[PDB]
Design an enzyme around this catalytic site. Structure first.
Site, mmCIF file in Angstrom:
data_model
loop_
_atom_site.group_PDB
_atom_site.id
_atom_site.type_symbol
_atom_site.label_atom_id
_atom_site.label_comp_id
_atom_site.label_asym_id
_atom_site.label_seq_id
_atom_site.Cartn_x
_atom_site.Cartn_y
_atom_site.Cartn_z
ATOM 1 N N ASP A 1 -0.462 -7.316 1.866
ATOM 2 C CA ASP A 1 0.226 -6.058 1.985
ATOM 3 C C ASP A 1 1.741 -6.235 2.230
ATOM 4 O OD1 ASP A 1 0.567 -3.325 1.961
ATOM 5 O OD2 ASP A 1 -0.503 -2.953 3.825
ATOM 6 N N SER B 1 4.149 2.307 8.284
ATOM 7 C CA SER B 1 3.846 1.244 7.316
ATOM 8 C C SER B 1 5.091 0.773 6.611
ATOM 9 C CB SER B 1 2.866 1.746 6.260
ATOM 10 O OG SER B 1 1.594 2.095 6.786
ATOM 11 N N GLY B 2 5.219 -0.523 6.423
ATOM 12 C CA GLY B 2 6.380 -1.094 5.766
ATOM 13 C C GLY B 2 7.496 -1.477 6.711
ATOM 14 N N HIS C 1 0.802 -1.224 0.000
ATOM 15 C CA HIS C 1 0.000 0.000 0.000
ATOM 16 C C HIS C 1 0.846 1.290 0.000
ATOM 17 C CE1 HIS C 1 0.172 0.289 4.481
ATOM 18 N NE2 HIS C 1 0.072 1.592 4.221
ATOM 19 N N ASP D 1 0.465 1.343 19.631
ATOM 20 C CA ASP D 1 0.290 0.804 18.288
ATOM 21 C C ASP D 1 1.294 1.457 17.292
ATOM 22 O OD1 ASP D 1 -0.897 -0.719 16.209
ATOM 23 O OD2 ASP D 1 -2.679 0.559 16.032
ATOM 24 N N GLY E 1 2.859 6.166 8.435
ATOM 25 C CA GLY E 1 4.257 6.560 8.347
ATOM 26 C C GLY E 1 5.133 5.427 8.841
HETATM 27 C C1 LIG Z 1 -13.966 -9.352 11.340
HETATM 28 O O1 LIG Z 1 -14.130 -8.687 12.598
HETATM 29 C C2 LIG Z 1 -13.173 -7.783 12.975
HETATM 30 C C3 LIG Z 1 -12.140 -7.389 12.136
HETATM 31 C C4 LIG Z 1 -11.255 -6.399 12.543
HETATM 32 N N1 LIG Z 1 -10.281 -5.945 11.617
HETATM 33 C C5 LIG Z 1 -9.272 -5.097 11.899
HETATM 34 N N2 LIG Z 1 -8.850 -4.514 13.012
HETATM 35 C C6 LIG Z 1 -7.791 -3.731 12.617
HETATM 36 C C7 LIG Z 1 -7.596 -3.837 11.288
HETATM 37 C C8 LIG Z 1 -6.484 -3.583 10.357
HETATM 38 C C9 LIG Z 1 -6.351 -4.406 9.236
HETATM 39 C C10 LIG Z 1 -5.304 -4.216 8.353
HETATM 40 C C11 LIG Z 1 -4.401 -3.196 8.560
HETATM 41 C C12 LIG Z 1 -4.533 -2.358 9.655
HETATM 42 C C13 LIG Z 1 -5.565 -2.542 10.575
HETATM 43 C C14 LIG Z 1 -5.693 -1.640 11.780
HETATM 44 N N3 LIG Z 1 -4.638 -0.644 11.967
HETATM 45 C C15 LIG Z 1 -5.019 0.713 11.605
HETATM 46 C C16 LIG Z 1 -3.442 -1.010 12.481
HETATM 47 O O2 LIG Z 1 -3.177 -2.174 12.730
HETATM 48 C C17 LIG Z 1 -2.381 0.107 12.705
HETATM 49 N N4 LIG Z 1 -1.151 -0.505 13.208
HETATM 50 O O3 LIG Z 1 -8.543 -4.728 10.818
HETATM 51 C C18 LIG Z 1 -11.398 -5.823 13.797
HETATM 52 C C19 LIG Z 1 -12.417 -6.229 14.633
HETATM 53 C C20 LIG Z 1 -13.312 -7.225 14.254
HETATM 54 C C21 LIG Z 1 -14.281 -7.687 15.261
HETATM 55 C C22 LIG Z 1 -14.686 -7.246 16.468
HETATM 56 N N5 LIG Z 1 -15.599 -8.118 17.020
HETATM 57 C C23 LIG Z 1 -15.716 -9.036 16.134
HETATM 58 O O4 LIG Z 1 -14.952 -8.865 15.028
#
Ligand SMILES: COc1cc(Nc2ncc(-c3ccccc3CN(C)C(=O)CN)o2)ccc1-c1cnco1
Ligand SMILES: *[C@H]1O[C@H](CO)[C@@H](O)[C@H](O)[C@H]1O
Ligand SMILES: *[C@@H]1O[C@@H](C)[C@@H](O)[C@@H](O)[C@@H]1O
Ligand SMILES: [Ca+2]
Ligand SMILES: [Ca+2]
Ligand SMILES: [Cl-]
Ligand SMILES: [Cl-]
Ligand SMILES: [Mg+2]
Lengths: 141, 254, 196
Positions: free
Chosen positions: B90, B192-193, B41, B186, B190
């Site tokens: 990714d 990323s990667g 990305h 977290d 910036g």
């Molecule tokens: C399918 O149900 C879910 C899916 C998720 N999915 C998710 N959480 C975070 C993200 C993500 C995916 C890719 C890339 C970055 C990020 C988040 N992010 C900004 C970071 O990791 C910065 N370091 O996706 C979360 C919660 C649920 C959930 C809650 N109760 C049941 O289900």
């Protein structure tokens, strides 16, 4: 023998040497709480009589169960698990420092990442380059 | 990085700063003198493919010292299955035009074997994440390299411990969770990667890549990283292949 | 093709700790992992066909730590189930005690309780219940003369009781191990009754 029944009440004669039922001990103790206290450990039986502890382990009787004390090389409820038969790559990486290769028939073999070579102990790795990957030189690599 | 500390100079020696037209783009991880692993990305909106620079030995973005080395990026390789603007697959593999020189400040991170990574590294509780990204979501970026220790979660635990708030894309087999759901720590935009590095019996290895950062440290969400063990074979094959004329190469995955 | 294990239960007495679960496996094997909330996961009972796993060697490394276990189901990420949290020092059952001896000194009686061995080791030897709990462990003595209506009770901070008795009377004894600072599972079962 009815002539043995002429003898007066005795916990040692009737219950220790011979067996004795709940009423026999209740006639000796008289109280319910006292007879129940004796009977819970008496009618429980020796779970350790079947010798359930293997590989030289020691049995300790409990109320309707037992505990096995194992020798250092063994584990499990009955000391059946030999700790020597667990040298597989999924068990603490087979004792390898870096890579572990499972081998059927023969034992597992440890390996190293590039820039490292396998030491004499067959499990440790040593760098063959000045700057091997994944080591921090300012903290003395 | 939110909730972290400054990485003492030389203690994250595999960290790469990617710049496009002199501007801070993304993070990366040096895996040998020629190859860098980053996130796909990061290259979504790139127009000037010949203006990509990788910087090694960087620590403080406001001061240049003798420890920094710069190399032009000759090739960015992304899996064909990756769809821009989305989360899955990714990962990007970068080929440097000329090799960097390994020094006390520039050292590669071990890319592990798939099996060692899946049955051993996956069960090491804490690993480190680093970067010059935002110090708060929507906040300003860091001038010195920041580092943060994060605990890994199996996806079942991660989904059960999360709240489906804001953007909740699916967490696939090519991703893994790491961090906290209490909004304190977290990796952010910036970062990323950058690497998610795991220490095992005296050596550090690449286990994850910082994926999308926007929305970092949201209460109810964990950090989500690219699961590098799924791409070992792919990265090793492409590292053996010859260069192509263009910068961007969408290579088949698997 | 597999089923997730269920009803994960800790069975523990004197630190001999076993995780148990349902159901019996059909074309599936099991692997258990154990951890402290910040330590790494350690694998146990590799590809077992049993519905139990002895986790004694792991929990005796620090009996005051809180552990979490998980059971994986593989066909002969995987399916797995988390166990309840378990803190050995607070939850292990106190084993059944044994009266070692009793001695009379006229109008007084010394009642000695045998050292209860635990699965906790300290270089070659097994530690007793008093070595691990110390001050937290007391023994209780239930005693009575055969001609009286009620029982009496004595308590000790060691493994010995020194009680007053009536002249020319036979007394019966039973002991119980207690950790008074607990609200749940604070006592062992009573020892077998011993009379003079
Ligand atoms: C399918 O149900 C879910 C899916 C998720 N999915 C998710 N959480 C975070 C993200 C993500 C995916 C890719 C890339 C970055 C990020 C988040 N992010 C900004 C970071 O990791 C910065 N370091 O996706 C979360 C919660 C649920 C959930 C809650 N109760 C049941 O289900
Ligand atoms: C002795 O016998 C078996 C083991 O052989 C065990 O299951 C019993 O509980 C014990 O009494
Ligand atoms: C009981 O304990 C085990 C561990 C062995 O030492 C036996 O010999 C002993 O009787
Ligand atoms: Ca018994
Ligand atoms: Ca600088
Ligand atoms: Cl260059
Ligand atoms: Cl004791
Ligand atoms: Mg009779």
């Amino acid at each position: 023998a009815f002539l043995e029944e002429l003898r007066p009440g005795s916990l040692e004669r009737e219950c220790k040497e011979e067996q004795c039922s709940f009423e026999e001990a209740r006639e000796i103790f008289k109280d319910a709480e006292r007879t129940k206290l004796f009977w819970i450990s008496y009618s429980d039986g020796d779970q350790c009589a079947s010798s359930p502890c293997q590989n030289g382990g020691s049995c300790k009787d409990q109320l309707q169960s037992y505990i096995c004390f194992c020798l250092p090389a063994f584990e499990g409820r009955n000391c059946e698990t030999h700790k020597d038969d667990q040298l597989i790559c999924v068990n603490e990486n087979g004792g390898c420092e870096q890579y572990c290769s499972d081998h059927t028939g023969t034992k597992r073999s440890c390996r190293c990442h590039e820039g490292y070579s396998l030491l004499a102990d067959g499990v440790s790795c040593t760098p063959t380059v000045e700057y091997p990957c994944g080591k921090i030189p300012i903290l003395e690599k | 990085i939110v909730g972290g500390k400054v990485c003492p100079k030389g203690e994250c020696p595999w960290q790469v700063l990617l710049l496009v037209n002199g501007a801070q783009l993304c993070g990366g991880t040096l895996i040998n003198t020629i190859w860098v692993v980053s996130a796909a990305h990061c290259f979504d909106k790139i127009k000037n493919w010949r203006n990509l620079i990788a910087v090694l030995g960087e620590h403080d973005l406001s001061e240049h010292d003798g420890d920094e080395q710069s190399r032009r990026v000759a090739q960015v390789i992304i899996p064909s299955t990756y769809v821009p603007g989305t989360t899955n697959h990714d990962i990007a593999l970068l080929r440097l035009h000329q090799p960097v020189v390994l020094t006390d400040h520039v050292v590669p991170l071990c890319l592990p074997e798939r099996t060692f990574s899946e049955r051993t590294l996956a069960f090491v509780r804490f690993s480190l994440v680093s970067g010059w990204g935002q110090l708060l979501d929507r906040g300003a970026t860091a001038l010195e390299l920041m580092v943060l220790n994060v605990p890994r979660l199996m996806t079942q635990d991660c989904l059960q411990q999360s709240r489906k708030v804001g953007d909740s894309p699916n967490i696939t087999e090519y991703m893994f969770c790491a961090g906290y759901s209490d909004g304190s720590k977290d990796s952010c935009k910036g970062d990323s990667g950058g690497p998610h590095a795991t220490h095992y019996r005296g050596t550090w290895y690449l286990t994850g890549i910082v994926s999308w950062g926007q929305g970092c440290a949201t209460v109810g969400h964990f950090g989500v990283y690219t699961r590098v063990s799924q791409y070992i074979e792919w990265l090793q094959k492409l590292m053996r292949s010859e260069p192509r004329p263009g910068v961007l190469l969408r290579a088949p995955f698997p | 093709n597999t089923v997730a294990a269920y009803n994960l239960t800790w069975k523990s007495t004197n630190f001999k700790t076993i995780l148990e679960w349902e159901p019996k496996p059909v074309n599936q094997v099991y692997t258990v992992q154990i951890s402290t909330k910040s330590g790494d996961w350690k694998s146990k009972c590799f590809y077992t066909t049993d519905t139990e796993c002895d986790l004694t060697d792991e929990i005796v490394k620090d009996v005051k730590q809180t552990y979490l276990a998980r059971v994986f189901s593989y066909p002969a990420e995987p399916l797995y189930e988390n166990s309840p949290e378990f803190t050995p020092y607070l939850e292990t059952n106190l084993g059944q005690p044994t009266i070692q001896s009793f001695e009379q000194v006229g109008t007084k009686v010394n009642v000695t309780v045998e050292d209860e061995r635990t699965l906790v080791r300290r270089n070659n030897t097994f530690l007793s219940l008093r070595d691990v709990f110390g001050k937290d462990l007391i023994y209780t003595l239930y005693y009575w003369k055969s001609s009286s209506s009620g029982k009496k009770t004595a308590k000790t901070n060691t493994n010995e009781f020194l009680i007053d008795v009536d002249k020319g009377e036979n007394y019966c004894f039973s002991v119980q191990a207690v950790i008074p600072s607990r609200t749940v599972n604070r006592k062992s079962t009573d020892s077998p009754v011993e009379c003079m």
